[PDB]
Amino acid sequence: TPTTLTQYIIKSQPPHSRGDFTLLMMAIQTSVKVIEKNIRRAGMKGMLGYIANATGDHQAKLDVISNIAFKAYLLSSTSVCVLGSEEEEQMIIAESGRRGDYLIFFDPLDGSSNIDANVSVGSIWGVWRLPKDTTINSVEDANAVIRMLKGTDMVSAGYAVYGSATNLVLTSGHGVDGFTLDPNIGEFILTHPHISIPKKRSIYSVNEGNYGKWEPWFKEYIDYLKMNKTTRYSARYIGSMVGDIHRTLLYGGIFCYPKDANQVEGKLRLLYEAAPMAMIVEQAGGKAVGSNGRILEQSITRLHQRTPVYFGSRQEVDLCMAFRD
Amino acid sequence: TPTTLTQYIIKSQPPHSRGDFTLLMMAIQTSVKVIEKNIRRAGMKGMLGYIQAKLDVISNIAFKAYLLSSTSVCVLGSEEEEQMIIAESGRRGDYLIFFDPLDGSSNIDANVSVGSIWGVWRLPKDTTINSVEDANAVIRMLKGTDMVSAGYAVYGSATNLVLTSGHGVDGFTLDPNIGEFILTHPHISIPKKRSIYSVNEGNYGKWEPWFKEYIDYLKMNKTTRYSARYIGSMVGDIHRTLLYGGIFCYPKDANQVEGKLRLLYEAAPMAMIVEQAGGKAVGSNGRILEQSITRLHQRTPVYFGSRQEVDLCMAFRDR
Amino acid sequence: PTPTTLTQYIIKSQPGDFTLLMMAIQTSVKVIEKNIRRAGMKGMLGYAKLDVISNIAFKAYLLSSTSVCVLGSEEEEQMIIAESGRRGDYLIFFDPLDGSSNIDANVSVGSIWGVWRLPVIRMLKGTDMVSAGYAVYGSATNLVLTSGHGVDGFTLDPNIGEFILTHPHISIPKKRSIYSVNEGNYGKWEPWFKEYIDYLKMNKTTRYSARYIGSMVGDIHRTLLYGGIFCYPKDANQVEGKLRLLYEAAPMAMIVEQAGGKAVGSNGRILEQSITRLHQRTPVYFGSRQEVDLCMAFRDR
Amino acid sequence: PTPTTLTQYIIKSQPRGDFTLLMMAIQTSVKVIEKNIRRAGMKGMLGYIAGANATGDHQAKLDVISNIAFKAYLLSSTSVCVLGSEEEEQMIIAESGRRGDYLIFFDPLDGSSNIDANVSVGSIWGVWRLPKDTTINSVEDANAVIRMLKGTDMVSAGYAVYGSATNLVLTSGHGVDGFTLDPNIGEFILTHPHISIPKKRSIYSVNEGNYGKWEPWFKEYIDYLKMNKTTRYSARYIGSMVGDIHRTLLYGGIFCYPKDANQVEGKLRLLYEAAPMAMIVEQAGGKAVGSNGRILEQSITRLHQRTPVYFGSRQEVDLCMAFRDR
Ligand SMILES: [K+]
Ligand SMILES: [K+]
Ligand SMILES: [K+]
Ligand SMILES: [K+]
Ligand SMILES: [Mn+2]
Ligand SMILES: [Mn+2]
Ligand SMILES: [Mn+2]
Ligand SMILES: [Mn+2]
Ligand SMILES: [Mn+2]
Ligand SMILES: [Mn+2]
């Protein structure tokens, strides 16, 4: 009898709790398993490539299927009032009799331009809980509510990695725990409890193809990692934010998506990429900052808002930020 | 009723052919499936190290078991073993197989892709291998250009098996419901040009000046913008290189002055696949496949990929 | 291509304890199915160990569910109480693995559960049962259940480890010419039942087909879907019967009744029988309402 | 760690690789069919096609899919010259130069009226080897060749059981060995080596719903099994010939499909049901007879020929035949 994610969560909540968070995490699990199913057989089911979004991404077929899955299960869960997907312009409101307390923002498939080459991909979600009195009855209401939220209010966050094994990592503000899908029983089993990101590790992750378009201070930082006399650094960039962040959490290191001469506001989205990953990184003992301190302290102005990121081992991030100053 | 790897191979061989190669590819398929099984559940079965090198051992055990019982092999050489192994007499076919049973094994704990690589030579016309001595003598008079088949498997979100027999490259995908590899990527053709480079830039300082120059050009040139990708799994990175185009480099180091990658069971198989897909695959002095094999764990640097991207790279090497 | 799961179905059915309970049951069933499929290679066959493993699974997941106060297994003499801070409202009685001497021959097996609710438990009636269900472990894996508003059947999708709705509103036909009984025991039956069986074979009007897998869950599942009758009659040895009331006959009776069939023992409805003792027994005559009527007509002369 | 596969077992068993390739094609077919059965409920493949085969069976959708599978893989194997399916009127010839030495007759899905109720089903095959200096170039040639064959010429036979586990049992004239599908690796693993059917066991398997239509001697035999003072019998009838025969081989007992007042020639087909099962039962140490002695000694007149069967533990079958001769 191994320990399932569901059991783990039931245990985590107080004696005879509400149960909404358990139902939510069921919906997420089912979605993740559906997506995993589709990815593993995509080649034979004709779902490789692209269709013939609000961020200007041309969509892979698995983006659409992923989004459909997440929405279907989350809305039927009875635990969500609002959902916001990368693949949708607008937020979606759950129907009145079927409306829980959670606002969930998700990237249903991260790295979708990796799938054709069997490089890892993932899903990311951040969960906020509807503020005490308030009631969201429309898209207008929801847009007003998100504007008065911060990453520091996020109650839970997590990602899934679709690779040789299927991982589901999550936090509820009391550390990070990692699970692995047992395909023989379709349950997520606790395999990586109390994930602690090392304080220092000589691994950096960034797209150096963009060297030319970076700020001078960041070119300097990267050059130092390569040219300094003291400590040798190793470079790794899978090109899947989830894949790279997962390696960062387990091995230590740093992961960067810096300011660009094109994307002067950044590549990564705040609500459904950067802030969830920031809560996970912080809870694992790491540091997660953007252009002006903590990602989680940034004010949310709009659903598809962007930010650069510098995430990872506390001291590696400190070194990086020392060049900025 | 989809097209299996097995049926594809049966069709590929001549009318009423011998059958050795079919049996070999069965053994390889079974091995790959056993390894895949173990990787997918490694976390729950204690084979990961959380709190490094058990899957190497299990992989090696699998490949050996199935290949030796296949009756198609005379000699095997694994990355995990110092010496070559001889198949027992009368369980002894015509193939010499050199394999990396698990490539990227320090990736597994982080769920980063890994693979298996194999190169197949066929015992020369008048030769008979009866011992380790014999085998060491035989490999010394072989080249990558004599390789009859090569392939790799990628263990990721899907499980791929890519291979060639000197008539192009074809890619298969494991259907886990029936445990057969299904043709999904027929006639893989690597683009002639594509702006993606793959190398560990952490080692910048230890590279030769010409290669530092090449990398700097990819970043600073006015004409064409390059994207950087380095998974750190040779199979993962090469597979992306074959399908997307680009370049993959493991250049000469100030430490590893002979190179990181092994010739027999990493560089030469991947070279035959890259060449068959329409790409170019070179080391320190031309084609990897034209290099003479001196020793089982011999090494070489590599510059592999899109023919024009490799040409560009080699243009910088001109002193 | 996002199918309807058992979990969603149940969430929709309610206006959370029962949802958590049905999670625990699902996980248990999947664990048991996993073990059965590979039992031959993992040494768990004879040639039962799977009774023990099954029981362990059900207990583990049901107790951690926080929805149970009491559980009773066929494999245990005594009932088990859930710990105080982890104690829901449900009493559950289950046969974690039915037909365990079938496994070595790859004949179907199943799991059966009956759920009562508490508002000491000296007597219950099947008519108070709030839910019941079984799983069938065969070439597909089925999970059939009721909550007093009909019967619905689900099938395990092994690719996602969820039970998918495949057989909604199972209705057992009123009449169907299939009978299920061990005729090896002919000699030990009561005269009226010998007469009934002889009539099924010798009557001029309607031809009957015989099927007996020898797994109660397998045979009852075929009975619900195809129609027919399933009998474990009184024996000259087992004068009180073979099947157990609390964790076999009464759950199956609620399912059969909710599907539109009839489910009786030696003296009327199984569900109306008083429960005196945990491992109490009863004969059964279950199935299509008219086939059971025909059977009972022979008993009454 | 690295278990013994069916493929390895077969490679070991041979001294030419034609039989190995054949058994690959069969394995793949069996795995494809298993795949389909496990998910049939969600893929809409439960029940029947809306519009009967050569023996008058209305077909289940899984009959058609199964038949397609077996044909596809067996023909691409390069080991077959002729194939005969239950689901086809005519035999099929493999294309010239994709043409091996084996004639294979198969029931691609046995018990297809069990699937909707999740009761076990199976596949059955019998393998003959083309006679010395015979050459099959058409359906005419094939029909001529089968007429001069017997079950005693069968080189191999086997079945698959699709249940909670997936079994594949086979013989090549040197006993019976049983395998089990490992779904994690899609290989059949040796689990039941040297299957030996007990000489005596008190279990009988027959559809007693047909009592009224049986011959008097067989009614007498069945009544004896129930009413005799000496030994008590247990009755089991799954209603899937493969399921019931598999239980018979492992537990012992008897399995009967006797002569009927309707089917006076019998229900079971000789080429792809009775004769393969007969070779397996004989190789396991049992006895397998029809209306006039050994099934395997019967002359094959036609592809969809029928026969009754009395199969199982040698002494149980002897007892049965004693009632016929009295
Ligand atoms: K995107
Ligand atoms: K190494
Ligand atoms: K039991
Ligand atoms: K049929
Ligand atoms: Mn996305
Ligand atoms: Mn993304
Ligand atoms: Mn390796
Ligand atoms: Mn028991
Ligand atoms: Mn029982
Ligand atoms: Mn049949």
CSV table of C-alpha atoms in Angstrom, one decimal, chain B residues 5-237:
chain,number,residue,atom,x,y,z
B,5,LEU,CA,9.1,-2.3,-36.3
B,6,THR,CA,9.3,-6.1,-36.6
B,7,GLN,CA,7.2,-6.2,-39.7
B,8,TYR,CA,9.1,-3.2,-41.2
B,9,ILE,CA,12.4,-5.0,-40.8
B,10,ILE,CA,11.0,-8.3,-42.2
B,11,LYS,CA,9.9,-6.4,-45.2
B,12,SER,CA,13.2,-4.6,-45.5
B,13,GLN,CA,15.3,-7.8,-45.8
B,14,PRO,CA,15.4,-9.8,-49.2
B,15,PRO,CA,13.0,-12.7,-50.1
B,16,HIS,CA,13.5,-15.6,-47.7
B,17,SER,CA,16.6,-13.9,-46.1
B,18,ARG,CA,18.6,-15.5,-43.2
B,19,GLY,CA,16.6,-13.9,-40.3
B,20,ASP,CA,19.5,-13.0,-38.0
B,21,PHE,CA,18.9,-9.3,-38.2
B,22,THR,CA,15.2,-9.7,-37.3
B,23,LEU,CA,16.1,-11.7,-34.3
B,24,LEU,CA,18.7,-9.1,-33.3
B,25,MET,CA,16.1,-6.4,-33.5
B,26,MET,CA,13.7,-8.4,-31.4
B,27,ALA,CA,16.3,-8.7,-28.7
B,28,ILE,CA,17.0,-4.9,-28.9
B,29,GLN,CA,13.2,-4.1,-28.7
B,30,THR,CA,12.7,-6.3,-25.7
B,31,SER,CA,15.7,-4.8,-23.9
B,32,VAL,CA,14.4,-1.2,-24.6
B,33,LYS,CA,11.0,-2.1,-23.3
B,34,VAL,CA,12.5,-3.7,-20.1
B,35,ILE,CA,14.6,-0.5,-19.6
B,36,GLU,CA,11.6,1.8,-20.2
B,37,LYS,CA,9.6,-0.2,-17.7
B,38,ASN,CA,12.3,0.3,-15.0
B,39,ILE,CA,12.7,4.0,-15.7
B,40,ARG,CA,9.0,4.8,-15.5
B,41,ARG,CA,8.7,3.4,-12.0
B,42,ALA,CA,12.3,3.9,-10.7
B,43,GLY,CA,11.0,6.4,-8.1
B,44,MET,CA,8.8,3.9,-6.3
B,45,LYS,CA,11.1,0.9,-6.8
B,46,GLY,CA,14.1,2.7,-5.0
B,47,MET,CA,16.3,2.9,-8.2
B,48,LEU,CA,16.9,6.7,-8.1
B,49,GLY,CA,18.9,7.9,-5.0
B,50,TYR,CA,16.6,10.6,-3.6
B,51,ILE,CA,16.9,11.7,0.1
B,52,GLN,CA,22.8,7.2,-9.1
B,53,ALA,CA,24.0,4.1,-11.1
B,54,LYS,CA,21.6,1.2,-10.5
B,55,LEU,CA,19.8,1.7,-13.8
B,56,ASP,CA,23.1,1.5,-15.7
B,57,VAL,CA,23.5,-2.0,-14.2
B,58,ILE,CA,20.0,-3.1,-14.8
B,59,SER,CA,20.1,-1.8,-18.4
B,60,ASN,CA,23.3,-3.6,-19.1
B,61,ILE,CA,22.0,-6.8,-17.7
B,62,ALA,CA,18.9,-6.5,-19.9
B,63,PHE,CA,20.7,-5.8,-23.2
B,64,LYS,CA,23.2,-8.7,-22.5
B,65,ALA,CA,20.5,-11.2,-21.6
B,66,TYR,CA,18.4,-10.7,-24.7
B,67,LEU,CA,21.2,-10.1,-27.2
B,68,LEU,CA,23.1,-13.3,-26.1
B,69,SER,CA,19.9,-15.5,-26.2
B,70,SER,CA,19.0,-14.0,-29.6
B,71,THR,CA,21.5,-16.3,-31.4
B,72,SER,CA,22.5,-13.4,-33.7
B,73,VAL,CA,25.6,-12.1,-31.8
B,74,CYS,CA,29.2,-13.3,-31.6
B,75,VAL,CA,30.6,-10.3,-29.7
B,76,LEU,CA,29.2,-7.7,-27.5
B,77,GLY,CA,30.8,-4.6,-26.1
B,78,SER,CA,29.1,-2.4,-23.5
B,79,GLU,CA,30.0,0.9,-22.0
B,80,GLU,CA,29.5,-0.6,-18.6
B,81,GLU,CA,32.1,-3.4,-19.1
B,82,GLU,CA,35.9,-3.2,-19.6
B,83,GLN,CA,36.2,-6.3,-21.8
B,84,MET,CA,34.2,-7.4,-24.7
B,85,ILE,CA,32.1,-10.6,-24.2
B,86,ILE,CA,32.0,-13.5,-26.5
B,87,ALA,CA,28.7,-15.5,-27.0
B,88,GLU,CA,28.9,-19.2,-26.3
B,89,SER,CA,29.8,-21.5,-29.3
B,90,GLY,CA,26.7,-22.6,-31.2
B,91,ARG,CA,24.7,-19.8,-29.7
B,92,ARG,CA,26.9,-17.5,-31.8
B,93,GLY,CA,25.6,-15.4,-34.7
B,94,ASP,CA,27.5,-13.0,-37.0
B,95,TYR,CA,26.9,-9.6,-35.4
B,96,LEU,CA,29.3,-7.6,-33.3
B,97,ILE,CA,27.2,-5.1,-31.2
B,98,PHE,CA,28.5,-2.2,-29.2
B,99,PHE,CA,26.1,-0.4,-27.0
B,100,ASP,CA,25.5,2.2,-24.4
B,101,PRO,CA,22.7,0.6,-22.5
B,102,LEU,CA,21.8,3.8,-20.7
B,103,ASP,CA,22.9,7.2,-21.9
B,104,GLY,CA,22.6,10.2,-19.7
B,105,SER,CA,22.2,8.1,-16.5
B,106,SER,CA,23.0,11.2,-14.3
B,107,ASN,CA,19.8,12.8,-15.7
B,108,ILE,CA,17.3,10.2,-14.3
B,109,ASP,CA,17.0,11.6,-10.8
B,110,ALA,CA,15.8,14.9,-12.4
B,111,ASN,CA,13.5,13.2,-15.0
B,112,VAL,CA,15.6,14.6,-17.9
B,113,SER,CA,15.6,12.4,-21.0
B,114,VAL,CA,17.9,9.4,-21.4
B,115,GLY,CA,18.5,6.8,-24.1
B,116,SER,CA,20.2,3.7,-25.3
B,117,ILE,CA,22.6,3.6,-28.3
B,118,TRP,CA,23.8,0.6,-30.4
B,119,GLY,CA,26.1,0.1,-33.4
B,120,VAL,CA,26.0,-3.2,-35.3
B,121,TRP,CA,29.0,-4.6,-37.3
B,122,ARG,CA,28.9,-7.9,-39.2
B,123,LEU,CA,31.8,-10.3,-38.6
B,124,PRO,CA,34.2,-9.9,-41.6
B,125,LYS,CA,34.2,-12.6,-44.4
B,126,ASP,CA,37.0,-14.9,-43.3
B,127,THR,CA,37.1,-14.2,-39.6
B,128,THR,CA,36.1,-16.3,-36.6
B,129,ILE,CA,36.0,-14.9,-33.0
B,130,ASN,CA,36.7,-17.4,-30.3
B,131,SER,CA,38.0,-15.2,-27.4
B,132,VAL,CA,38.5,-11.7,-26.1
B,133,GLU,CA,42.0,-11.6,-27.9
B,134,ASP,CA,40.4,-12.5,-31.3
B,135,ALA,CA,37.7,-9.7,-30.8
B,136,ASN,CA,40.3,-7.0,-29.9
B,137,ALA,CA,42.2,-7.9,-33.1
B,138,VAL,CA,39.0,-7.8,-35.2
B,139,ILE,CA,37.8,-4.4,-34.0
B,140,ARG,CA,41.2,-2.9,-34.9
B,141,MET,CA,40.6,-3.7,-38.5
B,142,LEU,CA,37.1,-2.1,-38.6
B,143,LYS,CA,35.7,1.4,-39.4
B,144,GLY,CA,32.3,3.1,-38.9
B,145,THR,CA,31.9,2.8,-42.7
B,146,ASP,CA,31.6,-1.0,-42.2
B,147,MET,CA,28.7,-0.6,-39.7
B,148,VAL,CA,25.7,-2.4,-41.1
B,149,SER,CA,23.0,-0.9,-38.7
B,150,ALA,CA,22.7,1.7,-36.0
B,151,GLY,CA,20.1,3.1,-33.7
B,152,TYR,CA,19.0,4.7,-30.5
B,153,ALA,CA,16.1,4.7,-28.1
B,154,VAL,CA,14.8,7.9,-26.3
B,155,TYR,CA,13.1,7.4,-23.0
B,156,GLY,CA,10.9,10.5,-22.6
B,157,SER,CA,7.2,11.3,-22.4
B,158,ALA,CA,7.0,9.0,-25.4
B,159,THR,CA,9.4,6.2,-26.0
B,160,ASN,CA,11.2,6.5,-29.4
B,161,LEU,CA,13.4,4.0,-31.3
B,162,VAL,CA,15.2,5.4,-34.3
B,163,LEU,CA,17.3,3.3,-36.6
B,164,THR,CA,19.1,2.9,-40.0
B,165,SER,CA,20.4,0.0,-42.0
B,166,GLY,CA,22.2,2.2,-44.7
B,167,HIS,CA,19.0,3.1,-46.5
B,168,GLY,CA,17.9,6.1,-44.6
B,169,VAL,CA,16.5,6.6,-41.1
B,170,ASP,CA,13.2,5.6,-39.7
B,171,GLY,CA,11.7,6.5,-36.3
B,172,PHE,CA,9.3,4.4,-34.3
B,173,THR,CA,7.2,5.0,-31.1
B,174,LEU,CA,6.4,2.5,-28.4
B,175,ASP,CA,2.7,1.7,-28.1
B,176,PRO,CA,2.6,0.7,-24.4
B,177,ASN,CA,-0.8,-1.0,-24.9
B,178,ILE,CA,0.7,-3.7,-27.1
B,179,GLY,CA,4.4,-3.5,-26.4
B,180,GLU,CA,5.3,-2.9,-30.1
B,181,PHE,CA,7.2,-0.1,-31.8
B,182,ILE,CA,5.0,1.6,-34.3
B,183,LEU,CA,6.4,3.4,-37.4
B,184,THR,CA,5.7,7.1,-36.7
B,185,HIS,CA,8.6,9.1,-38.3
B,186,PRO,CA,9.4,7.5,-41.7
B,187,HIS,CA,12.3,8.8,-43.8
B,188,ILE,CA,13.7,11.2,-41.2
B,189,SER,CA,15.5,14.0,-43.1
B,190,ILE,CA,17.6,16.4,-41.1
B,191,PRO,CA,17.3,20.0,-42.5
B,192,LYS,CA,20.4,21.3,-44.4
B,193,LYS,CA,20.3,24.5,-42.2
B,194,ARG,CA,18.7,25.4,-38.9
B,195,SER,CA,19.6,28.1,-36.3
B,196,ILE,CA,19.9,25.9,-33.2
B,197,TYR,CA,23.2,25.0,-31.5
B,198,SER,CA,23.7,22.5,-28.7
B,199,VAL,CA,26.8,22.5,-26.5
B,200,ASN,CA,27.8,22.9,-22.8
B,201,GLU,CA,28.9,26.6,-22.7
B,202,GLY,CA,29.8,26.1,-19.0
B,203,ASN,CA,33.1,24.8,-20.5
B,204,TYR,CA,33.8,28.0,-22.6
B,205,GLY,CA,37.1,28.7,-20.9
B,206,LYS,CA,38.5,25.2,-21.7
B,207,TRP,CA,37.7,25.2,-25.4
B,208,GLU,CA,40.1,25.8,-28.3
B,209,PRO,CA,40.2,29.5,-29.6
B,210,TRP,CA,38.6,28.6,-33.0
B,211,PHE,CA,35.6,27.0,-31.3
B,212,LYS,CA,35.1,30.0,-28.9
B,213,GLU,CA,35.1,32.1,-32.1
B,214,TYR,CA,32.5,29.9,-33.7
B,215,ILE,CA,30.2,30.1,-30.7
B,216,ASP,CA,30.7,33.9,-30.4
B,217,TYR,CA,29.8,34.3,-34.1
B,218,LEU,CA,26.5,32.3,-33.5
B,219,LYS,CA,25.6,34.8,-30.9
B,220,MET,CA,27.0,38.1,-32.3
B,221,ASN,CA,26.6,37.8,-36.1
B,222,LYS,CA,24.4,40.4,-37.8
B,223,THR,CA,22.6,38.0,-40.2
B,224,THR,CA,20.9,35.1,-38.5
B,225,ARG,CA,19.7,34.6,-34.8
B,226,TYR,CA,20.5,31.3,-33.1
B,227,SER,CA,18.7,29.5,-30.4
B,228,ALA,CA,20.5,27.4,-27.8
B,229,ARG,CA,19.4,24.1,-26.4
B,230,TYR,CA,21.4,21.6,-24.3
B,231,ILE,CA,19.4,18.9,-22.5
B,232,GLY,CA,22.6,17.2,-21.5
B,233,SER,CA,21.6,13.9,-22.8
B,234,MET,CA,23.4,13.0,-26.0
B,235,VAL,CA,20.4,11.0,-27.3
B,236,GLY,CA,17.8,13.7,-26.3
B,237,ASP,CA,19.9,16.4,-28.0
